[PDB]
Amino acid sequence: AQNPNCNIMIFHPTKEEFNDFDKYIAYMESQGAHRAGLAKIIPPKEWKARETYDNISEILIATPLQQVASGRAGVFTQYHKKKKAMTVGEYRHLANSKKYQTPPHQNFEDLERKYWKNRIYNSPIYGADISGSLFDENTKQWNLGHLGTIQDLLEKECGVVIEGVNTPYLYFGMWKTTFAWHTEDMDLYSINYLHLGEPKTWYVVPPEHGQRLERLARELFPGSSRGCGAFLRHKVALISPTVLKENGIPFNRITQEAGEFMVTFPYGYHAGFNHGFNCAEAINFATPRWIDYGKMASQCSCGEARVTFSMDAFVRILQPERYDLWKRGQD
Numbered sequence: 001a002q003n004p005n006c007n008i009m010i011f012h013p014t015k016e017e018f019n020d021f022d023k024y025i026a027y028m029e030s031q032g033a034h035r036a037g038l039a040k041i042i043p044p045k046e047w048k049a050r051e052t053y054d055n056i057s058e059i060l061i062a063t064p065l066q067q068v069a070s071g072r073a074g075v076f077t078q079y080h081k082k083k084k085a086m087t088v089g090e091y092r093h094l095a096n097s098k099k100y101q102t103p104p105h106q107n108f109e110d111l112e113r114k115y116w117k118n119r120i121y122n123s124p125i126y127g128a129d130i131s132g133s134l135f136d137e138n139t140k141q142w143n144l145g146h147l148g149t150i151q152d153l154l155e156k157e158c159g160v161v162i163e164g165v166n167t168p169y170l171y172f173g174m175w176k177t178t179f180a181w182h183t184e185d186m187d188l189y190s191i192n193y194l195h196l197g198e199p200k201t202w203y204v205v206p207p208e209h210g211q212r213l214e215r216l217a218r219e220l221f222p223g224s225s226r227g228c229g230a231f232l233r234h235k236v237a238l239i240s241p242t243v244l245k246e247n248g249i250p251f252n253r254i255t256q257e258a259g260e261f262m263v264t265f266p267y268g269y270h271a272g273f274n275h276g277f278n279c280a281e282a283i284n285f286a287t288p289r290w291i292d293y294g295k296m297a298s299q300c301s302c303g304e305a306r307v308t309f310s311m312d313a314f315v316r317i318l319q320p321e322r323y324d325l326w327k328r329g330q331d
């Protein structure tokens with residue numbers, strides 16, 4: 001068995017290997033990358049996502065979100081308070097202000113220590129889930145707006161034609177912006193490209209150990225767990241590496257820098273934080289190996305998780321018994 005300790009693997013494809021996306025994901029899995037739940041892909045030196053980032057300031061962040069925390073430093077929830085619209089140029093100036101900017105630090109480990117000590121005492125503002133793309137249309141390799149769609153994969157594997165579309169999303173971050181513990185909708189893959197700016201630190205639990213994280217979460221968030229049998233779908237709960245280690249939960253960590261891709265694998269729980277002003281692009285995708293995970297994915301039916309149009313069909317075809325209850329949650 002490849003990668004039996006479930007370590008995060010880092011890949012350096014050549015320009016020739018970067019042509020065929022599906023083939024390279026299958027290669028990484030042949031080497032055991034999915035056992036970690038997360039992999040890093042450094043593009044070949046010949047590749048670029050676009051020519052420059054000099055002209056992005058007029059993108060609108062229609063609904064910036066202030067991430068307000070409750071709890072203790074290592075075990076907290078966050079809620080998202082909606083703020084007034086602002087452009088990317090306005091948000092960058094905000095991120096760089098004395099109130100929000102990254103503090104002085106020695107290295108990524110010192111910054112990580114400062115994040116976990118102090119996150120709860122601040123409320124950073126995140127531009128999230130903004131439909132769009134920063135890949136140039138002429139970038140042919142690993143262009144996250146030109147991937148094969150999940151609806152087409154389900155049709156190729158299972159023969160059933162379904163409605164829905166699959167497009168990328170942009171994220172604009174600042175120091176302390178936080179992504180809560182979660183798996184993807186329908187336990188899909190994700191791919192994330194850090195276009196510019198400061199790094200993103202990730203934490204991940206191997207898929208084979210995901211139920212250990214769920215059991216700890218039910219212990220640490222006992223009201224939330226009574227409210228919903230899949231409350232991590234709400235994307236609000238944070239648990240620090242120190243708390244995970246104290247409770248014996250297997251996990252790994254890695255820092256993504258500008259110009260790098262990360263892939264999350266089906267049922268790989270992940271969480272993390274931004275180091276300073278940055279912009280990322282991400283999208284979900286599927287492979288044949290995903291289908292069995294889609295069929296088994298938990299679902300929130302309490303009403304909180306509320307998701308895209310295209311998840312309807314995935315539930316309807318892969319999880320017909322759950323469909324009626326899940327759809328009541330959506331309506």
Ligand SMILES: O=C(O)CNC(=O)C(=O)O
Binds near residue numbers: 270280
């Ligand atoms: O970058 C972020 O805020 C969150 N992204 C992801 O969870 C992802 O790519 O799966």
Ligand SMILES: [Mg+2]
Binds near residue numbers: 055056057058059
């Ligand atoms: Mg612009």
Ligand code: NI
Binds near residue numbers: 184190270
């Ligand atoms: Ni994710």
Ligand SMILES: [Zn+2]
Binds near residue numbers: 228231233234304305
């Ligand atoms: Zn719920």
